[PDB]
Amino acid sequence: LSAEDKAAVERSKMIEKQLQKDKQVYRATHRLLLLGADNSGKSTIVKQMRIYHVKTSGIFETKFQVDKVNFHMFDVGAQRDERRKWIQCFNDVTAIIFVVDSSDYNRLQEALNDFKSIWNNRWLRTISVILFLNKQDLLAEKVLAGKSKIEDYFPEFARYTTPEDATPEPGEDPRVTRAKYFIRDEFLRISTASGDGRHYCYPHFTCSVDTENARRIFNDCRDIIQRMHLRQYELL
Amino acid sequence: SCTIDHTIHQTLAPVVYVTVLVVGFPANCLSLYFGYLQIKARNELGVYLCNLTVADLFYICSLPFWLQYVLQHDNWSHGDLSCQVCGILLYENIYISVGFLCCISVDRYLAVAHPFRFHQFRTLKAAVGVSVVIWAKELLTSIYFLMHEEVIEDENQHRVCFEHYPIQAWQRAINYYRFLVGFLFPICLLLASYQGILRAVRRSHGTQKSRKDQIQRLVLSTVVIFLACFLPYHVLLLVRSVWEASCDFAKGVFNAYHFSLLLTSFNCVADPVLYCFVSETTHRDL
Amino acid sequence: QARKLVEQLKMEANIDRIKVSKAAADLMAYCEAHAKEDPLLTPVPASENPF
Amino acid sequence: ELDQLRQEAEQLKNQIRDARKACADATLSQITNNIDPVGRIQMRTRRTLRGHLAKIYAMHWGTDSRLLVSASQDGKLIIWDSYTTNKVHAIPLRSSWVMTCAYAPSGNYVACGGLDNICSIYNLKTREGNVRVSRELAGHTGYLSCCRFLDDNQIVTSSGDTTCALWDIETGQQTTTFTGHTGDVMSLSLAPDTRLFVSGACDASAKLWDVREGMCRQTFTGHESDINAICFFPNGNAFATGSDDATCRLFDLRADQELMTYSHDNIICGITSVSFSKSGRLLLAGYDDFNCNVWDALKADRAGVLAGHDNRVSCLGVTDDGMAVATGSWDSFLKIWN
């Protein structure tokens, strides 16, 4: 063994030690992918959630920490309309956070189509989706009014009765309780049409200004990891 | 000086021994292959499954000598040794299996009830360390049981293998410590881990109604089959050790103790089925 | 707006093209000439392979 | 007039198609049926490289045929030494998502890029022992797909938006921009003489460019679905492409035609990489179904199969000497076949 060979082996051992150090850090941080629309409020979340916890750039990274657990969120910007190619780079991610506006009736069908496209993608057949019905304050304001009618855009509304399993907060009119579970019903009906039991969709109701979304993401990710561990450790 | 009769010992033993051998050799070999497949793809259970299967094979390989002992009328022909070896693999090799069962239970509990914490306790190196500790306990117990010369002759010249009827003074303490350590600690650990797993799975959201009733069936089946395999043996062991020594009493419960010992041999058939066959991963590679 | 596309098509339309038999002969001749230098096709002696 | 322009364009397209239809003479299978088959080729694993953390999306051999560079989702470039399987360097990345790599011909630089819209250049040989970032190139809009060095001072890149560019390294400004596609472009291959370069995009078209001038010359449209790989035949007068249609094809430049199609009714998955050999006798291609394949270009009959992976194959490469072939898959393993 020449001196050069010994030096090369020593360098390889040092690099291997550093890589082993980095592996533990890598397998302690969970990656989340954020999707939405321009009319949505994903900017509001990424602004007033990381505070409490270059011109042409594609990926924006947000780091937050809940109960000493690290989370990295990735927002996609400056890209084109096509998504069939860069969506496959996200296969080992923990969850996809879909933020949908619940007040604009004009752009609800497009949101449903986008959710259907993400749900039935070939490369995303094992990734769960956390759904955020954002800006519920405006839905209440518009519902308790006359210059609007949700029955106009969707003709199936005047056949819907509120589900028995509901938890209306005190001080909410019955009207705002009915025109609010219909949207979740549509999204979950799209979810349960296919997918078998490999992946699930978690619904939530969220306002623009609130500090609970980190807790909700933590709970959903914990459930996802629990299900993966049940599959892995030979229980189901 | 107490020829005990052993009509039963010569009637039901051969059928059980031959059935266990035939059913449990290929089953354990296939379980070993599955354990290889798991350990290749960076899974911590693979170490435990492989070690459990190896312990089961070690137990199984000892039956043919016992089978020839049973076939023959009270006689043990091979040598003046290997009775202090096959005796170990028949009487004290059933606890490596329970140790690895408890290891699997704790691994499952830390995987499904605290998924965000204890990442360093579920790696391959920790599994190798605990496996080596369990096998070192096996080796120390095995360097025990050899300071005592244990072969006696019968009134009708025969050779009994690893049993003394009027229980000896030195065996009572072994019986007591065996009962406590091997059947009050492992059972408490199993119950306290599986209750936690069931609570965690019933508090979940993404699992459909059907699968929680399934996991429940598997968990109760595992615990119940373990109990039915082991509990009567230990109960009869205490019954003999505490206040059942006088030779007349001894002649009385020979059936009970040997029936319990014969029943405790089904672990080698139960373990590969419950830990290597009823799993979607095992059905996806066959 | 569309003048660029038609200009590109016009530029690419007038080019010098040859027969397919000529291209096939060229590729076949090149492969035959450099057929004795590819280690993948013909396994090399074990004293020459460094992997 | 819009109608007049559309009619003129349609007529000119018909005219250019007529010349192609007329110049066709004979299938390659008729002239190639007088050459003995390659024989059954059976290649086996010789080395194995471990150490990556997650999937790998790139791989490029150097010019000395002994060093290697790889990329992974964890954000790490590792420089290997294939003979002794040691590790020579370990470069951490600013952006985690990387989907391309390159190795400078001289042996001084390594380039990487991805969803971050930046093509980074690294300096391996410094006065100090560490490796540091030389210059970051910016100016695209979409996502990079491939980068290849011409000399130590120029570089050619691909982008998500329909555009390809040529850069200068000392001065970070662009020097020429290439336009004309209608979809995402995803592969590059510089010519051996470093004067022409061809690329393929997601609109079932492949184009050739002149680097000095800046204008397209020919357009080929054999594919129906989107193209995923491209590489030059060693001559410099042909190039082969693979697509998500499960069919590979081989074009030539002077004839301006489409010669052969490697179609099989058993395979349904798509192609994910294509690379030739030293003699131009074996075509290698990765597939989505956990296996790689070997084809004989002149006769179009499958000859070999290379299956040792547990996930999807993503990269492929052949050394300049001709004495090794490397693959990479999403199981974080490199396999140096031979």
PDB file of C-alpha atoms in Angstrom, chain D residues 222-306:
ATOM      1  CA  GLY D 222     -40.971  11.022 -35.550  1.00  0.00           C
ATOM      2  CA  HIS D 223     -42.290  10.878 -31.966  1.00  0.00           C
ATOM      3  CA  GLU D 224     -45.948  11.164 -30.914  1.00  0.00           C
ATOM      4  CA  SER D 225     -45.524  11.653 -27.155  1.00  0.00           C
ATOM      5  CA  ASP D 226     -42.767  13.475 -25.291  1.00  0.00           C
ATOM      6  CA  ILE D 227     -39.017  12.849 -25.672  1.00  0.00           C
ATOM      7  CA  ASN D 228     -36.896  11.939 -22.646  1.00  0.00           C
ATOM      8  CA  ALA D 229     -33.337  11.363 -23.910  1.00  0.00           C
ATOM      9  CA  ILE D 230     -30.975  12.028 -26.806  1.00  0.00           C
ATOM     10  CA  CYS D 231     -27.348  11.265 -27.659  1.00  0.00           C
ATOM     11  CA  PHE D 232     -25.021  11.302 -30.664  1.00  0.00           C
ATOM     12  CA  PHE D 233     -23.865   8.238 -32.481  1.00  0.00           C
ATOM     13  CA  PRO D 234     -20.038   8.451 -32.422  1.00  0.00           C
ATOM     14  CA  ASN D 235     -19.825   9.465 -36.099  1.00  0.00           C
ATOM     15  CA  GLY D 236     -21.594  12.796 -35.764  1.00  0.00           C
ATOM     16  CA  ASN D 237     -24.240  12.081 -38.426  1.00  0.00           C
ATOM     17  CA  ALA D 238     -26.954  10.353 -36.372  1.00  0.00           C
ATOM     18  CA  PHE D 239     -28.756  10.579 -33.047  1.00  0.00           C
ATOM     19  CA  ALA D 240     -31.153   8.323 -31.158  1.00  0.00           C
ATOM     20  CA  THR D 241     -34.060   9.336 -28.936  1.00  0.00           C
ATOM     21  CA  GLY D 242     -36.344   7.561 -26.487  1.00  0.00           C
ATOM     22  CA  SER D 243     -39.793   8.574 -25.331  1.00  0.00           C
ATOM     23  CA  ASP D 244     -42.731   7.737 -23.079  1.00  0.00           C
ATOM     24  CA  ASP D 245     -44.274   5.853 -26.022  1.00  0.00           C
ATOM     25  CA  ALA D 246     -42.114   2.786 -25.183  1.00  0.00           C
ATOM     26  CA  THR D 247     -40.340   3.088 -28.557  1.00  0.00           C
ATOM     27  CA  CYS D 248     -36.825   4.236 -29.422  1.00  0.00           C
ATOM     28  CA  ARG D 249     -35.844   5.687 -32.790  1.00  0.00           C
ATOM     29  CA  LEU D 250     -32.686   6.533 -34.732  1.00  0.00           C
ATOM     30  CA  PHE D 251     -32.451   9.521 -37.076  1.00  0.00           C
ATOM     31  CA  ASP D 252     -29.790  10.671 -39.522  1.00  0.00           C
ATOM     32  CA  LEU D 253     -28.998  14.200 -40.610  1.00  0.00           C
ATOM     33  CA  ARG D 254     -28.133  14.237 -44.322  1.00  0.00           C
ATOM     34  CA  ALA D 255     -31.066  11.991 -45.248  1.00  0.00           C
ATOM     35  CA  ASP D 256     -33.516  13.933 -43.032  1.00  0.00           C
ATOM     36  CA  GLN D 257     -35.587  10.813 -42.400  1.00  0.00           C
ATOM     37  CA  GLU D 258     -36.376   8.223 -39.725  1.00  0.00           C
ATOM     38  CA  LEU D 259     -34.610   4.896 -40.089  1.00  0.00           C
ATOM     39  CA  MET D 260     -35.426   2.237 -37.472  1.00  0.00           C
ATOM     40  CA  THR D 261     -37.827   1.670 -34.576  1.00  0.00           C
ATOM     41  CA  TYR D 262     -37.101  -0.699 -31.676  1.00  0.00           C
ATOM     42  CA  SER D 263     -40.663  -1.757 -30.868  1.00  0.00           C
ATOM     43  CA  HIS D 264     -41.663  -4.695 -28.671  1.00  0.00           C
ATOM     44  CA  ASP D 265     -45.196  -5.725 -27.739  1.00  0.00           C
ATOM     45  CA  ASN D 266     -44.227  -6.997 -24.284  1.00  0.00           C
ATOM     46  CA  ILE D 267     -42.765  -3.719 -22.985  1.00  0.00           C
ATOM     47  CA  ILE D 268     -45.256  -1.008 -22.013  1.00  0.00           C
ATOM     48  CA  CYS D 269     -43.298   1.364 -19.741  1.00  0.00           C
ATOM     49  CA  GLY D 270     -41.315   4.353 -20.984  1.00  0.00           C
ATOM     50  CA  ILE D 271     -37.663   5.048 -21.701  1.00  0.00           C
ATOM     51  CA  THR D 272     -35.577   7.132 -19.314  1.00  0.00           C
ATOM     52  CA  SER D 273     -32.055   7.352 -20.838  1.00  0.00           C
ATOM     53  CA  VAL D 274     -30.132   6.399 -23.985  1.00  0.00           C
ATOM     54  CA  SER D 275     -26.396   6.112 -24.648  1.00  0.00           C
ATOM     55  CA  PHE D 276     -24.316   4.523 -27.401  1.00  0.00           C
ATOM     56  CA  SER D 277     -21.048   2.563 -27.287  1.00  0.00           C
ATOM     57  CA  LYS D 278     -17.533   3.127 -28.605  1.00  0.00           C
ATOM     58  CA  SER D 279     -17.978   1.201 -31.852  1.00  0.00           C
ATOM     59  CA  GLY D 280     -21.560   2.128 -32.579  1.00  0.00           C
ATOM     60  CA  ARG D 281     -22.743  -1.480 -32.316  1.00  0.00           C
ATOM     61  CA  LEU D 282     -24.742  -1.628 -29.068  1.00  0.00           C
ATOM     62  CA  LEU D 283     -27.466   0.788 -27.953  1.00  0.00           C
ATOM     63  CA  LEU D 284     -28.212   0.940 -24.228  1.00  0.00           C
ATOM     64  CA  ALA D 285     -31.439   2.276 -22.746  1.00  0.00           C
ATOM     65  CA  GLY D 286     -33.037   2.397 -19.317  1.00  0.00           C
ATOM     66  CA  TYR D 287     -36.715   1.733 -18.678  1.00  0.00           C
ATOM     67  CA  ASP D 288     -39.377   2.392 -16.050  1.00  0.00           C
ATOM     68  CA  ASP D 289     -39.914  -1.312 -15.248  1.00  0.00           C
ATOM     69  CA  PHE D 290     -36.815  -1.777 -13.019  1.00  0.00           C
ATOM     70  CA  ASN D 291     -34.644  -3.132 -15.863  1.00  0.00           C
ATOM     71  CA  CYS D 292     -32.214  -1.913 -18.505  1.00  0.00           C
ATOM     72  CA  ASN D 293     -31.897  -3.319 -22.010  1.00  0.00           C
ATOM     73  CA  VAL D 294     -29.339  -3.768 -24.783  1.00  0.00           C
ATOM     74  CA  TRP D 295     -30.153  -3.363 -28.477  1.00  0.00           C
ATOM     75  CA  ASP D 296     -28.274  -3.923 -31.741  1.00  0.00           C
ATOM     76  CA  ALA D 297     -28.781  -0.817 -33.853  1.00  0.00           C
ATOM     77  CA  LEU D 298     -28.172  -2.163 -37.352  1.00  0.00           C
ATOM     78  CA  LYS D 299     -30.478  -5.185 -37.081  1.00  0.00           C
ATOM     79  CA  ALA D 300     -33.080  -4.192 -34.439  1.00  0.00           C
ATOM     80  CA  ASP D 301     -33.196  -7.404 -32.400  1.00  0.00           C
ATOM     81  CA  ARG D 302     -32.913  -7.457 -28.618  1.00  0.00           C
ATOM     82  CA  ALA D 303     -29.726  -9.095 -27.369  1.00  0.00           C
ATOM     83  CA  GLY D 304     -29.153  -8.546 -23.649  1.00  0.00           C
ATOM     84  CA  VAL D 305     -30.836  -7.708 -20.363  1.00  0.00           C
ATOM     85  CA  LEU D 306     -29.330  -6.086 -17.270  1.00  0.00           C
TER      86      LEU D 306
END
